[PDB]
Amino acid sequence: PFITVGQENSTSIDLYYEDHGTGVPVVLIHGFPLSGHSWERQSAALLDAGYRVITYDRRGFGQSSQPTTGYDYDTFAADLNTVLETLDLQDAVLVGFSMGTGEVARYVSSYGTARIAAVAFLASLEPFLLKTDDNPDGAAPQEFFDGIVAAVKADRYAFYTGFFNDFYNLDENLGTRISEEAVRNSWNTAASGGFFAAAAAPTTWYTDFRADIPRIDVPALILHGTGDRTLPIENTARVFHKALPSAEYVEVEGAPHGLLWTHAEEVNTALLAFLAKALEAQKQKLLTEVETYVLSIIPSGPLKAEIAQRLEDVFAGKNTDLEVLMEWLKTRPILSPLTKGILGFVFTLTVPSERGLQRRRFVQNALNGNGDPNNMDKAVKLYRKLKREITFHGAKEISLSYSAGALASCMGLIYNRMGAVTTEVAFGLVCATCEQIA
């Protein structure tokens, strides 16, 4: 999986990325000098929680292309933008690490937060690393950073082992927090990067982000270890906390720089606690929107009120048995068969506790579609567009074109254990079919 972001000479600067899981998109940006695979402990906990994980490799690092141009944060942000535009992500979360936090703060400032719901800064560079007469809160003068760039160009392979010692604090963490095999992969990941990228990237560490911080309007999370070597805490996060008081501030006690692996228990705990508090407001907004499209089919009366509460208890998570429900749903005087099917459909997508034994006939004949071959031949063409679809905003848009007949049969395909798509796009088909009946 590759996304093109640039064009160097006769080649195209392509970036490696991975799009896993279904739900709220969480974009992860790695640090120097690793790949997107470095988030393998965080990506694990984000998948079990239900989030959609998207990790991409920075140019010159990992499996991405290795050009000798475009090594400033204006290019690094222009790449992140192209990725978000190509993926068409909406209300996503940007989580950065090391250099990754430098793109999270630059993109937000330069392109806005129309696609952003929340951000996070793990072991950040912000606001400034370079120590000048202007900024005393710097970590080191430019002579120091020029000492690193030269030390890479001499022998970048021998430079890595020294760097990955101040990355994990191996004299304290090896054999306890991190194994030597785990370290080896990090070296293998770094050594398999672009030689030019390894020598040009350190010149971006001392970037002035003081102008980009105020442009953060979305909820933010700031995290940093108290034993960081590459990025001293009192020169970064401690003074990042004063620049943006709106963000929650978390110091992991005794954590090194590469705290993504060493303190995975601590990081994942805080990262999930932040997301489930800053995304809860929008994650249920669909549940009341899906409820809206569903209720716009039910004829007004005593039924419409109880049905709406059979959606409230279910969407929330209250215990509801289907047998009393589905029986009751069938024997209805004013409900047309087609609505019985949609309700029977939605009531199965939202609960994993249907006992997994029986199916219903009143819905199965409702989501039939008469049995017309042409009507079925279009329904599978929709499912084809839905099996390669991800978002609710996209599944509804596509399934609003096809006729009301093909929509019924397409819902049947998913319901009759034939086709299979995520519950987020399943609502899309439902809410699109509901707009047809309006």
Q: For this structure, is 246 an active site residue?
A: no
Q: Cβ closer to a second copy: 149 or 233?
A: 149
Cis? peptide before 33, omega within 30° of 0:
yes
Amino acid at 284: Q
Alpha-carbon span 127 to 182, nearest angstrom: 31
324 touches 412 (CB < 8 A) = no
Q: Cβ closer to a second copy: 245 or 373?
A: 373
Closest CA to 68 of 6, 19, 16: 6
Amino acid at 392: F
- Site residues (CB under 8 A) for a second copy, limited to 294-313: 299
Q: Residues 362, 291, 313, 25: is their CA dihedral positive or negative?
A: positive
Query: Does 325 interact with a second copy (rule: CB under 8 A)?
Result: no
Query: Does 323 interact with a second copy (rule: CB under 8 A)?
Result: no
Query: Does 289 interact with a second copy (rule: CB under 8 A)?
Result: no
Contact window for a second copy (CB under 8 A) among 212-220, 226-234, 270-278, 282-290: 212-220
Alpha-carbon span 71 to 63, nearest angstrom: 17
Query: Does 7 interact with a second copy (rule: CB under 8 A)?
Result: yes
- Site residues (CB under 8 A) for a second copy, limited to 118-177: 134, 153, 155-158, 160-161
Residues 6 or more apart whose CB falls under 8 angstroms from that of 182 comprise: 261
Residue whose token pair is 């007004």: 300
Q: Cβ closer to a second copy: 250 or 307?
A: 307
Give me the DSSP letters along 347-398: HHHS-S-STTS---HHHHTTSS-TT-HHHHHHHHHHHHHHTT---HHHHHHH
- Nearest distance, CB of residue 203 and a second copy, angstroms: 14
Interaction pattern, residues 35-54, with a second copy; x per rule: CB under 8 A: --x--x--xx--x----x-x
Contact window for a second copy (CB under 8 A) among 107-115, 136-144, 226-234, 267-275: 107-115
Q: Exactly one of 212, 228, 263, 399 is catalytic; name it.
A: 228
Interaction pattern, residues 341-370, with a second copy; x per rule: CB under 8 A: ---------------xxxx-x--xx--xxx
Q: For this structure, is 110 an active site residue?
A: no
- Site residues (CB under 8 A) for a second copy, limited to 256-285: none
Q: Which of 244, 286, 295, 380 is the binder for a second copy (CB under 8 A)?
A: 380
Q: Exactly one of 35, 91, 224, 257 is catalytic; name it.
A: 257
Phi first, then psi, for residue 67 (nearest 5°) are: -80, 165
Q: Based on C-alpha coordinates, what's the Rg of the chain?
A: 26
Residues carrying an active site annotation: 98, 228, 257
